[PDB]
Amino acid sequence: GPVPSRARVYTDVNTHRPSEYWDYESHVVEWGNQDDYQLVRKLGRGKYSEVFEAINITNNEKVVVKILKPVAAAKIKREIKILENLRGGPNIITLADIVKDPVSRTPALVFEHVNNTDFKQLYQTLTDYDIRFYMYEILKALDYCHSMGIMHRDVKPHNVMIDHEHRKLRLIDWGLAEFYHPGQEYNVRVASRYFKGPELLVDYQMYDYSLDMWSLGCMLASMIFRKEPFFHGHDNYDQLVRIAKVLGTEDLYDYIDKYNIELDPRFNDILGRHSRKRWERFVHSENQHLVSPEALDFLDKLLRYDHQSRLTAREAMEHPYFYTVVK
Ligand SMILES: CCc1ccccc1-c1c(Cl)cc(CN)cc1Cl
Numbered sequence: 001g002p003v004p005s006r007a008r009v010y011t012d013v014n015t016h017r018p019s020e021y022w023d024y025e026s027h028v029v030e031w032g033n034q035d036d037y038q039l040v041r042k043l044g045r046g047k048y049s050e051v052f053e054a055i056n057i058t059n060n061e062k063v064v065v066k067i068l069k070p071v072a073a074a075k076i077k078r079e080i081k082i083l084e085n086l087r088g089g090p091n092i093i094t095l096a097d098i099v100k101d102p103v104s105r106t107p108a109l110v111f112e113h114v115n116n117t118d119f120k121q122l123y124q125t126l127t128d129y130d131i132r133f134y135m136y137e138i139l140k141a142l143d144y145c146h147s148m149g150i151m152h153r154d155v156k157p158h159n160v161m162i163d164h165e166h167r168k169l170r171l172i173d174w175g176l177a178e179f180y181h182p183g184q185e186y187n188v189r190v191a192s193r194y195f196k197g198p199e200l201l202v203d204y205q206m207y208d209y210s211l212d213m214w215s216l217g218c219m220l221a222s223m224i225f226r227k228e229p230f231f232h233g234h235d236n237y238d239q240l241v242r243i244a245k246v247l248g249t250e251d252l253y254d255y256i257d258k259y260n261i262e263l264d265p266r267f268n269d270i271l272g273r274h275s276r277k278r279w280e281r282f283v284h285s286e287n288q289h290l291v292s293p294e295a296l297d298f299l300d301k302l303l304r305y306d307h308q309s310r311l312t313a314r315e316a317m318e319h320p321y322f323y324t325v326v327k
Pocket of ligand 1: 122134135159160161162219220223
């Protein structure tokens with residue numbers, strides 16, 4: 001069967017802390033007052049919630065209200081416990097309150113409001129300096145949650161709010177987040193397709209915080225190369241083939257061999273044989289201003305098949321790519 005794996009950092013976080021820290025099922029929710037909030041406009045709806053802009057009438061402040069759709073009671077308590085555990089952490093969205101919505105009869109999570117700058121505007125105009133600056137801010141959020149024994153598992157651009165005017169960033173939507181317990185087998189049906197780590201794509205369940213570092217590398221590659229998304233799979237199988245056309249099939253086979261993973265036989269007809277490509281292949285006159293030897297070296301250290309070989313968030317923060325960032 002598969003060779004077991006454990007993170008190379010923060011393995012003992014959930015053993016050192018008390019059971020009440022990670023046993024989200026035993027957590028008792030402290031309910032706020034729904035009457036303190038007035039919904040202003042619907043901002044969006046995903047598979048698990050409807051999101052609104054609202055006002056806290058007790059202090060007249062703007063808030064964001066996430067009304068959860070009826071789902072397994074386990075997923076709800078998990079998100080709340082993770083949000084409370086991480087509250088106050090650098091660049092972590094602040095959970096301000098939990099109320100029972102009178103209409104849905106489900107919990108409604110109230111967050112601090114972030115004036116999110118238009119995604120297209122950010123993607124099209126952030127500078128090389130700005131990309132390094134915001135990447136450093138995301139790393140502060142990731143190292144903080146990992147150090148707190150939690151993996152986000154849904155790192156993608158739509159989960160990173162940026163108020164560019166105030167140079168403020170928040171990592172949001174902790175609905176797919178989980179506590180990391182060494183030896184635990186997790187569900188591989190996490191993260192959005194283009195951000196899924198090879199571990200998920202080859203159905204290796206004993207993954208860890210390093211999955212977030214792969215997703216972070218996908219975001220960086222898309223930004224600096226002006227290719228959105230970087231690995232553009234038509235499905236979860238074609239997603240692995242798209243990665244293999246860049247990183248090569250020989251390192252893919254070394255990875256699955258290391259962990260005694262057998263690829264799903266449906267890959268026989270679609271994978272093929274691909275050499276590893278040099279990152280300079282993706283450089284051109286329309287993205288050269290965002291590329292540097294430091295950027296390519298950093299990307300190379302995130303986008304590795306072997307989850308145990310990727311930079312951790314804390315190691316990533318001392319990479320030369322961030323030397324130019326004012327600290
Ligand atoms: C393209 C992702 C990216 C890579 C590097 C620096 C910033 C970003 C980024 C992020 Cl994280 C969030 C948003 C807004 N949701 C926009 C952008 Cl441009």
